[PDB]
Design an enzyme around this catalytic site. Structure first.
Site, PDB file in Angstrom:
ATOM      1  N   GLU A   1      93.367 114.920  59.662  1.00  0.00           N
ATOM      2  CA  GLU A   1      94.080 115.957  60.403  1.00  0.00           C
ATOM      3  C   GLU A   1      93.200 116.787  61.352  1.00  0.00           C
ATOM      4  O   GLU A   1      93.099 118.015  61.236  1.00  0.00           O
ATOM      5  CB  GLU A   1      94.910 116.822  59.434  1.00  0.00           C
ATOM      6  CG  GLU A   1      96.056 115.997  58.822  1.00  0.00           C
ATOM      7  CD  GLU A   1      96.843 116.687  57.720  1.00  0.00           C
ATOM      8  OE1 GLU A   1      96.244 117.381  56.867  1.00  0.00           O
ATOM      9  OE2 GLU A   1      98.079 116.495  57.693  1.00  0.00           O
TER      10      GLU A   1
ATOM     11  N   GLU B   1      98.735 108.384  53.681  1.00  0.00           N
ATOM     12  CA  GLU B   1      99.534 109.223  52.775  1.00  0.00           C
ATOM     13  C   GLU B   1     100.994 108.820  52.903  1.00  0.00           C
ATOM     14  O   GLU B   1     101.495 108.648  54.013  1.00  0.00           O
ATOM     15  CB  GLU B   1      99.402 110.707  53.122  1.00  0.00           C
ATOM     16  CG  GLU B   1      97.985 111.268  52.994  1.00  0.00           C
ATOM     17  CD  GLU B   1      97.785 112.549  53.782  1.00  0.00           C
ATOM     18  OE1 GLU B   1      96.914 112.563  54.682  1.00  0.00           O
ATOM     19  OE2 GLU B   1      98.498 113.540  53.508  1.00  0.00           O
TER      20      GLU B   1
END
Ligand code: NA
Ligand code: NA
Ligand code: NA
Ligand code: NA
Lengths: 211, 211
Positions: free
Chosen positions: B69, B145
């Site tokens: 991220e 994820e």
């Protein structure tokens, strides 16, 4: 190849045409018995070459087809290359021998389902969504035949169209097919009725499978 | 990078490991503000290079990750190439900036759905089946994820696995995540209870999103 006027009408009215060589050897065992045999290369080549020489100036023709249901043989590969050589302006497709052979620019299966695999030996029909992303596969997918419209049918048609719109490389298909091949007979009163296979004393025959 | 004993245990018990650089700049606006900035390349490179120098002899480590991220910046591209050059033995992945940038060998989205597209601007989460066959795309897809296991959850888990099994290039993923990040606090009587964000006077906080 169709009656010459067909192409003129498709030019002027606006329809994309797949022009297809008059080669189908479906009844051979295996299907490619003739198309893999070099002795049948001359006969096959004339059915491809003479089609291209006749129709190559029609804008409506956008894709050449090497024929239908004749397995995959070396003659297909030779004629695939012949067209690519003489007319680079159009893709060449052919479904025989598993729909994704070296003789086709377009993955063009018949009756491959949207989500469901049909893993037949040698010539599987993968889910069309899955087919696109098989290791190494890059080509567009357009079904040469799908949504078999026999009698009370076209169930699940919406499912194809949802997938066509979601997946860039799913670029549609050609429904099988446009018109029932029924023929008119007359009863004792002289009234017409729609006839299919067997109704002419023809035997063996495949009954209503022509509609 | 984990405590050093973790890799030894994964080597010995047998677990595939994605070793990930300590780089996350999620809170920046936009997310790549630091990672596209050449002045932050030095600090970033050390987090990658020193990880590689430490863990490169562990068989359990099969994939390097550039972090998490932090959008996609030119610094990722440089560090991607650095690893490729110093260690050709392992693929490099990185999800930031759309999960399929030039800084990743693996399409590695977070929370991309099986069938349903999420067409966010700039960083869409395509259906994983669709993502694979986007024009020109060839890479494997493994979610970094998926199946967010927050509280009463993992609904639709079977849908992922059915897809993983049907599609060769859909090679699985990493559930988020293993263990609730709850902490033990004690009541007036000295009895333990599970605490989350905000329970320590910490403010602002994001409450139960750590579990
Ligand atoms: Na499409
Ligand atoms: Na038929
Ligand atoms: Na798979
Ligand atoms: Na969280």
């Amino acid at each position: 190849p169709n009656h010459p006027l067909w192409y003129t009408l498709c030019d002027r009215y606006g329809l994309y045409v797949v022009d297809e060589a008059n080669i189908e050897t479906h009844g051979m065992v295996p299907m490619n018995r003739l198309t893999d045999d070099p002795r049948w290369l001359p006969a096959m080549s004339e059915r491809v070459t003479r089609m291209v020489q006749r129709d190559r100036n029609h804008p409506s023709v956008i894709i050449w087809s090497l024929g239908n249901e004749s397995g995959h043989g070396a003659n297909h590969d030779a004629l695939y290359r012949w067209i690519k050589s003489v007319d680079p302006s159009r893709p060449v497709q052919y479904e025989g021998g598993g729909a994704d052979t070296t003789a086709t620019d377009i993955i063009c299966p018949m009756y491959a389902r949207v989500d469901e695999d049909q893993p037949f030996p040698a010539v599987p029909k993968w889910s069309i969504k899955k087919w696109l992303s098989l290791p190494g596969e890059t080509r567009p997918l357009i079904l040469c035949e799908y949504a078999h419209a026999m009698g009370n049918s076209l169930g699940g048609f919406a499912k194809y169209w949802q997938a066509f719109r979601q997946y860039p490389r799913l670029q549609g298909g050609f429904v099988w097919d446009w018109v029932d091949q029924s023929l008119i007979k007359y009863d004792e009163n002289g009234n017409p009725w729609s006839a299919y296979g067997g109704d002419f004393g023809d035997t063996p025959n495949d009954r209503q499978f022509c509609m």
